[PDB]
Amino acid sequence: MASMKKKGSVVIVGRINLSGDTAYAQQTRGEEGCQETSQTGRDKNQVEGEVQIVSTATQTFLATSINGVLWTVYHGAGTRTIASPKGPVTQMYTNVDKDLVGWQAPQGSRSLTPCTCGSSDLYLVTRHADVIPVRRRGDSTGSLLSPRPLSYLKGSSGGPLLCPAGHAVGIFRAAVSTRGVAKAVQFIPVESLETTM
Ligand SMILES: C=C[C@@H]1C[C@]1(NC(=O)[C@@H]1C[C@@H]2CN1C(=O)[C@H](C(C)(C)C)NC(=O)O[C@@H]1C[C@H]1CCCCCc1nc3ccc(OC)cc3nc1O2)C(=O)NS(=O)(=O)C1CC1
Ligand SMILES: [Zn+2]
């Protein structure tokens, strides 16, 4: 019981840059470094942007900042802390029934704003910065306009689904697939984010 360990913190290893001409993923911490920043929690690298790429010692996914909170998904993060300059940081929101968790948006970062103009055709940002047209077919669901394998959507949970203007409509959570070809998607409607707040 003395020779016991603890599940390290979630570490920011990069970001999906969207603030210019094109969308592209940037790496900020290697694998050997992330394996350490998760064991300590002391993350010195400053934060920029809205969509961050996060990793645990065994998995990797995304996290989106909205209304001043860095949201992600529970099945990737769990109750883990996040590495901040001032050590680990406890989540200020945890709802397993929704598969949702959140930390205070670190400084130096920007937080999207919920879309209030009614989203019709959404755009899903993937782990590899790809922007995939989604046709909102529900309140938390959206069919894909172009079919592609599930393998290109794995590790994208916690990412954003965006208005044509760029506001946030939800948080990619699960995928609807048949025969290995993803046909639709589901997300956490940003209104439920507000309700949790
Ligand atoms: C392909 C990419 C896809 C975005 C990803 N999401 C998933 O794979 C989720 C995880 C799990 C199964 N998922 C699915 O998408 C399934 C699957 C058949 C597997 C495609 N699809 C599906 O159900 O269709 C039905 C409409 C949905 C409604 C019913 C499902 C409800 C969703 C859900 N809620 C909870 C609450 C609490 C929990 O505690 C442990 C756990 C949960 N797990 C869940 O779904 C992803 O990349 N993750 S990740 O980044 O690689 C990860 C390593 C970090
Ligand atoms: Zn909008």
Instruction: Pick the last residue of a domain from 104, 137, 157.
Output: 104
Instruction: Pick the last residue of a domain from 46, 72, 104.
Output: 104
Number of domains observed in the structure of the chain: 2
Cα–Cα dist 139/187, whole Å: 9
Query: Which ranges in the chain belong to alpha helices (H)?
Result: 31-40, 74-77, 190-196
- Whether 135 is covered by a domain: the verdict is yes
Residue 153 sits in which domain range?
Answer: 121-197
For this structure, is 99 an active site residue? yes
Resolution of the entry in angstroms: 3.5
For atom 8 of ligand 1, which residue has the closest CA?
174
What is the 171 CA–ligand 2 centroid distance (Å)? 15
Please check whether residue 184 is in contact with residue 172, taking contact to mean a CB–CB distance below 8 angstroms. Answer: no
18 and 98 co-located in one domain: yes
For atom 34 of ligand 1, which residue has the closest CA?
99
Experimentally, how was this structure solved? X-ray
Choose the catalytic residue: 119, 140, 156, 157: 157
152 and 92 co-located in one domain: no
Beta strands at 69-72 and 168-178: parallel, antiparallel or unpaired: unpaired
Measured between its terminal Cα atoms, the distance across the chain in Å is 38
CATH number for the domain including 45? 2.40.10.120
Proximal ligand: closest to the CA of 120: 2
CA-angle at 129, arms to 125 and 131, nearest 5°: 45
Please check whether residue 124 is in contact with residue 143, taking contact to mean a CB–CB distance below 8 angstroms. Answer: no
Proximal ligand: closest to the CA of 10: 1
162 and 197 co-located in one domain: yes
- Whether 178 is covered by a domain: the verdict is yes
Token duo for residue 148: 């592609």
- Whether 65 is covered by a domain: the verdict is yes
130 and 89 co-located in one domain: no
Cα–Cα dist 156/96, whole Å: 18
The alpha carbon of 40 is separated from its chain's Cα centroid by a whole number of angstroms, namely 22
- Whether 3 is covered by a domain: the verdict is no
CATH number for the domain including 144? 2.40.10.10
Please check whether residue 88 is in contact with residue 74, taking contact to mean a CB–CB distance below 8 angstroms. Answer: no
Instruction: Pick the last residue of a domain from 55, 74, 104.
Output: 104
Please check whether residue 184 is in contact with residue 146, taking contact to mean a CB–CB distance below 8 angstroms. Answer: no
